[PDB]
Amino acid sequence: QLSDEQKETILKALNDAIEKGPWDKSNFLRVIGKKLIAIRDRFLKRIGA
Amino acid sequence: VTDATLGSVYSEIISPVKDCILTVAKAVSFNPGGKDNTDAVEVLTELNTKVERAALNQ
Structure with missing residues (x-):
């Protein structure tokens, strides 16, 4: 469902906010x-599965 | 569990971030005129908007 481009953009958004x-x-x-x-x-955990 | 999906992003990221924003907004309504809670609202809003955009592919 999710592409590598999306996973990689959502993770940074989260880490940036944290x-x-x-x-x-x-x-x-x-x-x-x-x-x-x-x-x-x-x-x-999900994208790592 | 399984890999991440659109439904996954909405239910485990977008929706819980919205709960954080509402909780912080609630804190703002109590007390008071602090700069910290305000900044949290802005940071969290930007986070969901960025994730909301990504989930829309563009």
Whole structure:
């Protein structure tokens, strides 16, 4: 369904957001950043299958 | 599980990111005039828009 071009563009978007977001600015924001990481990790598991 | 698909992207990325945006927006409505939550809304919005675009192939 997904092409290598799409997988490769969605992964960076996620990593970029995880990297640049204000996820260390507060306890609340850390939880949100963690969810983003779980979303990023969930996606990797799939394209890795 | 299986490889990623459009349905997969929507249900496991786009939809959960939307939940994060709504949660952050809710935080903004409580307190207060902070620059951090605002930035999170922008970053998350850009993320979904980028993924939403990719999922549309263009």
